[PDB]
Design a binder for this molecule. Structure first.
Ligand code: NA
Ligand code: NA
Lengths: 405, 397
């Protein structure tokens, strides 16, 4: 409970006490994140987009509606979208008509999506043209999906990659992606071993794999990879099968479909738990930590020190480095209280500007990781930070192009 | 078919069937409008919005909220099918049980959000605590909203909700109005096509709207409202003390300003604005918005050797986050003129050609979209030239 409490306290998480139970956190029935949490999730999403889309020339972005055509025939559980008017129009405005009306709702009402797969399949022919039918290629999208709880509606941010490839290399690609995705979660982890995988198969015998994170109450699947075959793709283009073929060298084939879907929200919670260390400190990876640095003032002329801090902030923000402007506060807290709070907020570095600074331009820099302080000239702070971050980011990008198996 | 829309569909900035390329379809938001190049363009626009509105403003924090709100008016309601199947199972009809059902739905079912405002209001108290009750501050979010047509359209909204003392509300509204209009204009080829006007709602609250002059007429792409505190109070009935912020020595329920832009319509706006029958059409999207920054192709020579060079160059650029079109991957051959025409339609900033010559002295042919002039450059300098050029266009802000 210490982790969730700290997170709610420091605004990584949001919600009432009833909304902070493990069940409520996993249901997705309420917006789980506070500002610092939204920032962390945004950074995670960015890292996903860089590794899966930006750095892979065969992967394109796709966007699809949150709502899908109504059917009800299959008897699925997706929520239906019903116009309040139509309901009012039949009410205040027979018994056999009411039943007919209800029958209509079920059969014709649109529904909220449960996965991002269909959005990709629907845009497959378009991307086929974009790449001149050359296989393999993928469609990526990060978006919210809905799922029924217990009658509550849960919302989950899904990160999806749908990979179209000839059947003959489908097995190898599934293995390539499983390895690539596992290493992606681990490069940001304090305890990489807490991120694991397990192979599986579906009711139809199709192979796939799942990635898990070991939460205190057990392992939860944060990502799944499935080798779906061509069934769903074929069903998406009835009567046009002859024209949805891609090129596998000199051969034309209906591609096999690999679906890779990660849960960004659960993944964000995963890093929060993974970063918690005992002084309570959250050691989120430098690329994920919402706030990179904090600027505060020590003893000395208020207005002048604040001015120096303001210049430093502008310079950092201009470099895209997030900054917590602690010097703006009433600052009636001790140094120990300040550092303990920053440690809980996962602030990478805290800087202290004082009278001395006005004299020899030196500032005190405290590292969240080691908690060791040290002097440095205010003119070198930007360079140190920019470099420290690039180095962390470069280490994490070590194997982004490694050819697995 | 209209030239701009036709080019956009052909080059995958847009998606959809021909019927969905009419002005009404594109405005309704009743189909996913964008293709891969459009989705990239829109993402670049969203990034620039986040930079200006959130990254570069210490008083603005990110906020995330659900797509559905509690049970409004015309917003569609979310209904579990199981619950409907439960009643349809009953062998006994009874107009009493049925009517009571369609009644309970109309009163307990959640509904799809029409704006991001309420999500911001709901997260207000938490952020107030984060900033030690210091006013002013804002909560920002980019997300999709639903709007019943006349089918319910989906639109990506970029929202900033500003909490400030009423005494400074009008000053802040005017600041945001000017700031937002300039933001739209800085990326435009014809900034004068982005205009503004004052407005007021039914309650008499003052506001402003930004418009883009589409060929068929002006369309609102952003609205700014000085909402006062009505909605905030309605969000936190009872504990008024928990929502008061600090205005110096005073504790006050803040006035709320709503600044919302339509990122989808804005994407369509820049596409029309980029269109130039210059030389044959070309899309002159701002360098910060153009989805594809560079294209790589091979000239006459040893296929495998030339492609190998292109691969190394592509990996170098991608690692630097520069988007690259791997034309050299194509098996079908096309003339150079055909290539450049296509790249201009795709808004590609620079076009690079690796040839036999490149294999000897390492020099490549670099053609710019904007000037349409070709020039030789050593493959070892390309990466630096591009990273710099882009960083330079982005710095102009
Ligand atoms: Na890509
Ligand atoms: Na900010």
């Amino acid at each position: 409970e210490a982790l969730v409490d700290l997170c709610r306290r420091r605004h990584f998480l949001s919600g009432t006490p009833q909304q902070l139970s493990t069940a409520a956190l996993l249901s997705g029935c309420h917006a789980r994140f506070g500002p610092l949490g939204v920032e962390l999730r945004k950074n995670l999403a960015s890292q996903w987009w860089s590794s899966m889309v930006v750095f892979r020339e065969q992967v394109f972005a796709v966007d699809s509606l949150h709502q899908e055509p109504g059917s009800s025939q299959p008897r699925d559980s997706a929520f239906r979208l019903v116009s309040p008017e139509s309901i009012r129009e039949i009410l205040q405005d027979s018994k056999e008509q009411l039943v007919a009306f209800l029958e209509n709702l079920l059969k014709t009402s649109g529904k909220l999506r449960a996965t991002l797969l269909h959005g990709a399949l629907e845009h497959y022919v378009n991307c086929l043209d974009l790449v001149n039918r050359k296989l393999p290629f993928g469609l990526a999208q990060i978006g919210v999906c809905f799922h029924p709880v217990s009658t509550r509606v849960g919302e989950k941010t899904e990160a999806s990659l749908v990979w179209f490839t000839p059947t003959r290399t489908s097995s190898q690609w599934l293995d390539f992606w499983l390895r690539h995705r596992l290493l992606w979660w681990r490069k940001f982890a304090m305890s990489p071993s807490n991120f694991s995988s397990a192979d599986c198969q579906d009711e139809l015998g199709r192979k796939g794999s799942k990635l898990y994170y070991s939460f205190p109450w057990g392992k939860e699947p944060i990502e799944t990879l499935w080798n779906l075959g061509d069934q769903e793709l074929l069903h998406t283009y009835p009567g046009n099968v002859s024209t949805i073929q891609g090129r596998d060298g000199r051969k034309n084939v209906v591609p096999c479909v690999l679906s890779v879907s990660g849960d960004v929200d659960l993944g964000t919670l995963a890093y929060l738990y993974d970063s918690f260390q005992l002084r309570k400190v959250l050691k989120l990876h430098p690329c994920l930590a919402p706030i990179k640095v904090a600027l505060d003032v020590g003893k000395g002329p208020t207005v002048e020190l604040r001015q120096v801090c303001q210049g430093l902030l502008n310079e950092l923000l201009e470099n895209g480095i997030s900054v917590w402007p602690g010097y703006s506060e009433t600052v009636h807290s001790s140094l120990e209280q300040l550092h303990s709070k920053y440690d809980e907020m996962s602030v990478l570095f805290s800087v202290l500007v004082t009278e001395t600074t006005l004299e020899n331009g030196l500032i005190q820099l405290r590292s969240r990781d080691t908690t060791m302080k040290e002097m440095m000239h205010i003119s070198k702070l930007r360079d140190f930070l920019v470099k420290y971050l690039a180095s962390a980011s470069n280490v994490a990008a070590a194997l982004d192009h490694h050819h697995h198996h």
